Amino acid sequence: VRKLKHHEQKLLKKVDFLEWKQDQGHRDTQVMRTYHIQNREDYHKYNRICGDIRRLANKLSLLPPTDPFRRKHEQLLLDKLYAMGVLTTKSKISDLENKVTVSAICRRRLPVIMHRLKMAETIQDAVKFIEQGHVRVGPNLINDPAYLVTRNMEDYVTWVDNSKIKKTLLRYRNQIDDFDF
Amino acid sequence: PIEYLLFEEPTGYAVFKVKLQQDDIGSRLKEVQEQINDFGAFTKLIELVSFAPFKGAAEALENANDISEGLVSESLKAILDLNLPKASSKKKNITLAISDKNLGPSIKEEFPYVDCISNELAQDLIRGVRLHGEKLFKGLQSGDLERAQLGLGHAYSRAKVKFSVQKNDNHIIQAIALLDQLDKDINTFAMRVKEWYGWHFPELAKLVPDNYTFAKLVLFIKDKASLNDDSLHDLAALLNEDSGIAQRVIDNARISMGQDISETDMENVCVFAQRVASLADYRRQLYDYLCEKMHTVAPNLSELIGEVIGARLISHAGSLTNLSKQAASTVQILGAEKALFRKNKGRISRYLANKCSMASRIDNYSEEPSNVFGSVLKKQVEQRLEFY
Amino acid sequence: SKTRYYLEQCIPEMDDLVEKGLFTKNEVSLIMKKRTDFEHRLNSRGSSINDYIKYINYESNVNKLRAKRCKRILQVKKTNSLSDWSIQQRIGFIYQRGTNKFPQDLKFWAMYLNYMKARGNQTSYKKIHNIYNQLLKLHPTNVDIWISCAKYEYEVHANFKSCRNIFQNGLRFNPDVPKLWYEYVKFELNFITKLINRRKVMGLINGDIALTIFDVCMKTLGKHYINKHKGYYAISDSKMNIELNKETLNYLFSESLRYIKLFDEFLDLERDYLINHVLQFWKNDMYDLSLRKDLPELYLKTVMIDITLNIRYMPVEKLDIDQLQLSVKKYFAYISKLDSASVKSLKNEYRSYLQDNYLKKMNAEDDPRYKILDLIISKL
RNA sequence: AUCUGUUUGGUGGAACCUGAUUAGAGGAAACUCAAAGAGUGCUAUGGUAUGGUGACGGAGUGCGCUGGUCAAGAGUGUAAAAGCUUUUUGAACAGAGAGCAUUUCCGGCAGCAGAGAUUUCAGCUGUU
RNA sequence: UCGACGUACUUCAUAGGAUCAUUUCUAUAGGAAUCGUCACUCUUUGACUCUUCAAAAGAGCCACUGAAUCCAACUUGGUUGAUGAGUCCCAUAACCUUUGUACCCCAGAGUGAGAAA
Ligand SMILES: [Mg+2]
């Protein structure tokens, strides 16, 4: 729409064709951009899992502070989330509410971990290498760029043996051994 | 209560009719000021009813003077009479908006039945007509207002200044710039004529060193083979036989080393020699004109030192006004590169420069300078010369 | 929009056409479709006067078609209803809009005046006057307009008084145009000749004013010609001033000569009296130049007219020897005051004038005056 | 020079720190296709919309309106005046198109002759 | 180890004015915006094609039918000149040297009250 004149803007204050309150600030689109999420509904599936954690933490908080049941369950939740890599620290229980976000889960997707391990220059580049069958976790090739990698499984992300990328790494340092390939 | 508007253009007089009257109480409000800028709003206020162009440039200047003096010209009287309706002198009067208040009393005298208005309301309409200009004339032939302003502007300005061609001294600067150019070209072309005919008769260039005489002779003796006693007399008439060149050329043309050039080549030499002849005559004609102009423009300066030397001095300063404004010392160094004014020798030069400075002042600031003061001023220098 | 208002103004007419049966609704639809195009053309940017001309021509053809179906179908010269004058009213309105939008185009103004003059019964003369009042104000300096309304009111209506005031007012704006002077004097001589011919008519059943205009014409025209060719400034050079003075004398001489030719037409007036005033005018020194000394060629023509003045209009049948004797007597008198070169030219012209006008039209054998003229011609 | 090793200019851009940015950063092409911003140009002109519904128009009469000249009246002023004001009246004159009525004629039809390029307008006689 | 006293030290307020927030009005009359689009110039952004840093993967095979590039061959032009190659900073010129000709050896934004006896 053209720029509204003064008298028009006064009579059309709430008119906005591109930003609505139900959009929630386009947080989904922003986060999908940062971590290169290709399925439009992956964010809102993560959001429902975050909501489940936040619902449980709120219910636990309403239990009396010295309750052994409360302390046990909050620790188990902190243990499980830290192991998955969603939570960076286990010290504080308020992290279950403040620091449990969709961005935290997206930050454990295979492309992002490849980027942080410097296996790819960008998350977009990592997605392409996954889709092109260069990446293996353990002995298993993975072409799904939504694979969530736990802390323990981050040790087994590596290139496929006959990958052209692997040969380039070894050729660059003059360490290519054609017996292996 | 404004009903008609008078606007004065460089091209002619325009009369408009006010269709709507703008608000007076709210005159200073912004929206009534903006409508003057907007043509869509303005055109609803006024409309053109008449336009009477001036006959020519002369009439434009006369009406520019009359409008400047707040007088009603015959042309202005005609357009107003044709347009303004007749009304009572007392009961009710047609209203006319005029830019100048001094013009009001004049129009009232000619037309008792029109009341003139020049208040701020009238000025706003006049400002709008000026602002939009030819756009309001609905294509009527108003020429081009910007161009006619330039012509009328110079005319009006000089008429008050009473500028005259007599005060013009740039003719002197042109003449001197041309005169020395002719002195260069006459020599350069004359030298070429010596070379070209030198091939056909090289020794003759030695016989007649003076180039102008050489050109006239070559025009006669086109081919050195042609040698007759009557021809000897005819070339003997050219210049004089005192130098004996008349006998030398006839004897020498008989025995010479010049290789004969084609007829077409000779045609160029005579025509090119003819060319050198024309510039020599034109140069003398221009030289007399410079002498005549110097007396008219700067009789004192010309009489005191001379026409050519004065002309060079004016050109160096760049103008007669520039020469006058200079101090006496600056005038002395103005002619110190060509020695125009030239220990005791320097004292005359310094003395002469001061007198030349005063002579310039008399010439520049007098509408019709005389040579009376130049004569006595030169006489004063002569006494100083004898003393030293 | 303006277009819709103008289209709706057509509806009462188009409804009347259907009612009278002259046009069918489909045909009425086609006419409005073409009008819709034109009204949009006129109300839009980029409209030119050609759009007005086309729309006027189209409406004219519609009127002709309506008139012909009126006789073919209704079998009546007129149907007393709006459709009779609706088109004619509309065409006048297009002309008003065109002239207001484009006052510069003089061709369109001429078309408007011709159209309104042609339907005199429909358009009162007062409406013609309003157009001329508006046109004259927009173009005061176009002499053709001033003559046109001057002519229109003197032939259609014969208001010498109002036709006079037009020339009085026109010359007030354009004193430097010799054509307007020439036409104004032509009207006055026509007014006098019509008056005398009216006087002649009464008897059976029972020019100075022009010269005053000529005299002021000579004065006024010279003044403006000096103002032109001088530009903003006077001419300092004495010689160039004298040249400019000659140009006016030659310019004014040519204009005065045209008036001499103009007098020839009016048989009723004592033209010889009218001509002699012009000759008397040129005897007086003007602008410090004497015709005899500075411009002999013009002076010879002035003498030529004077010598033949009494015999100029005498037919060969009524040729009087005494008048010829007066004519030749004038010729010798000027010779004694003329140089040899001037005398030779005057002698040749005078011989030719007598030979062509009289001798070649005289029978040599039957007229005794032939021998006298031949003897005079030989002696001249 | 198997001398010396600083400066100036180019190439290159480790570490630390600082700032900005981030579905990495760019380039080329155009009578290409879109979505926007700013400025400029254009008589861009109904303050209440053509003269006209035979509900009409034209011609003419009267009324009305306008201009100044003249005469008289009223007021003011004077010893008497002169002079000045007048929304006081009348006369003749010069007008505008700018209002109101007016059926007094015309705009149906035939004939006469005239002006202009078969068509347009003006006039005269008869007739509805 | 804690108290009381003494000493030393850290921290804490509050005002005046304006504007923006009500799909008119944030409370104030001291303020400024109500129009059915026709062109042209400039600017910003985004598509489409191609591409660099700068690579990686190919919905995969056969058949027919067109196109482009590089060699071979042939045909034209070619040492009486193919190809490549800054006219565009005047070689139609600048600068230096020599010679000849004509003038010059006081101050320069010149100074400003002496000179003569
Ligand atoms: Mg506050």
Q: Which residue in this structure is represented by tokens 């030979």?
A: C355
Rounded to whole angstroms, the Cα distance separating B20 from A83 reads: 86
Determine the residue type at B204. L
Cα C278 versus chain centre, distance: 22
CB neighbourhood size of C95 (10 A): 20
What's the CA gap between B344 and B118, in Å, rounded?
A: 73
Q: Identify whether the C-beta of residue B296 lies closer than 8 Å to the C-beta of residue B314.
A: no
Strands B94-97 and B4-8: parallel
Looking up tokens 């003089």 gives C106
What three-state secondary structure class fits C312?
coil
Cα distance between residue A63 and residue A73, in whole Å: 11
Bridge partners of B331?
none
Task: Report the alpha-carbon distance of residue B277 to residue B16 in Å, rounded.
Answer: 67
Q: In degrees rounded to 5, what are phi and psi of residue B47?
A: -150, 145
d(CA B375, CA B358): 13
Report d(CA A113, CA A148) in Å as an integer.
9
Burial of B218 (0-12, 13-18, 19+ CB in 10 A): buried
CA nearest neighbour of B125 among B148, B106, B97: B97
HSE-up (13 A, CA, CB side) for residue A180: 10
Sign (positive or negative) of CA dihedral B271, B274, B276, B281: negative
- Closest CB to B58: pick one of C101, C138, C230: C230
Strand A135-137 to B46-53 pairing? unpaired
Q: Is the CB of C121 under 7 A from strand D?
A: yes
Instruction: Identify residue C112 by its one-letter amino acid code.
Output: Y
C-alpha dist (Å) from residue B367 to A140, B164, B370, B378, C98? 113, 9, 10, 22, 59
Residue B139 has its nearest CB partner, among C104, C169, C231, at: C104
Tell me if C9 sits within 8 A of C65, measured CB to CB.
no
CB pair distance less than 8 Å for B58 and C227: yes
Q: What single string gives the DSSP state of each residue in B195-229?
A: HHHHHHSTTHHHH--SHHHHHHHHHH-S-TT---H
**Stated resolution in angstroms:** 3.0
Tell whether the torsion through CA atoms of B338, B340, B345 and B350 is positive or negative.
negative
Indicate left, alpha or beta for B62 from its phi (over 0: left) and psi (-120 to 50: alpha). alpha
C-alpha closest to that of C287 among C244, C323, C230: C244
Cβ contact C93:C87 at 8 Å: no
- Complete DSSP assignment for C11-50: HHHHHHHHHHTSS-HHHHHHHHHHHHHHHHHHHSTT--HH
**Which residues fall within 8 angstroms of residue A89, CB to CB, at 6 or more apart?**
A82, A95
| Residue B13, both tokens | 């007089």
Which parts of chain C fold into alpha helices (H)? 2-20, 25-43, 49-69, 82-101, 106-118, 125-138, 143-152, 160-173, 178-205, 208-227, 238-265, 271-283, 291-294, 296-307, 321-335, 340-357, 368-379
3-state SS class at B42: helix
Q: Are B280 and B212 in contact (CB under 8 A)?
A: yes
Q: What are phi and psi of C156, to 5 degrees?
A: -65, -45
CA B104 vs CA A91, B107, B153, C375: distances in Å: 97, 5, 24, 76
If one counts every other C-beta atom within 10 angstroms of the C-beta of residue A79, the result is 12
Q: Does C198 touch chain B (CB under 8 A)?
A: no
Name residues whose C-beta falls within 8 Å of residue C316's C-beta, 6 or more positions apart in sequence: C357, C358, C361, C362
Residue C233 sits at the chain B interface (C-beta within 8 Å): yes
* Integer CA distances (angstroms), A47 to A23, A104, C271, in order: 14, 11, 119
- Largest Cα–Cα distance of chain A, in whole Å? 79
Pull the structure tokens for residue B196: 């070209």
| B140 touches C103 (CB < 8 A) | yes
How do beta strands B114-117 and B94-97 pair? parallel
Angle between helices B211-220 and B170-200 in degrees, nearest 10: 50
Location of structure tokens 């003393």: B387
Report the C-alpha gap between B60 and B68 in whole angstroms. 12
Tokens of B218: 């070559």
Burial B69-96 (b: 16+ CB within 10 A, else e): eeebbebbebbbebbbeebeeeeebbbb
CA gap C81, C16 in Å, rounded: 8
Provide the 10 A C-beta neighbour count for residue B229: 9
B295 in Cβ contact with B311 (< 8 Å): no
- How far is it, in rounded angstroms, from Cα C29 to Cα C31? 6
Residues 19-58 of B, Cβ under 7 A from nucleic strand E: 30-31, 38, 40
C45 touches strand D (CB under 7 A): yes
Structure tokens at B240: 């004089």
Task: Compute and round to an integer the Cα radius of gyration of chain B.
Answer: 36
| Contact predicate B307/B290, CB 8 Å | yes
The β-bridge partners of B95 are: B115
SS3 B115: strand
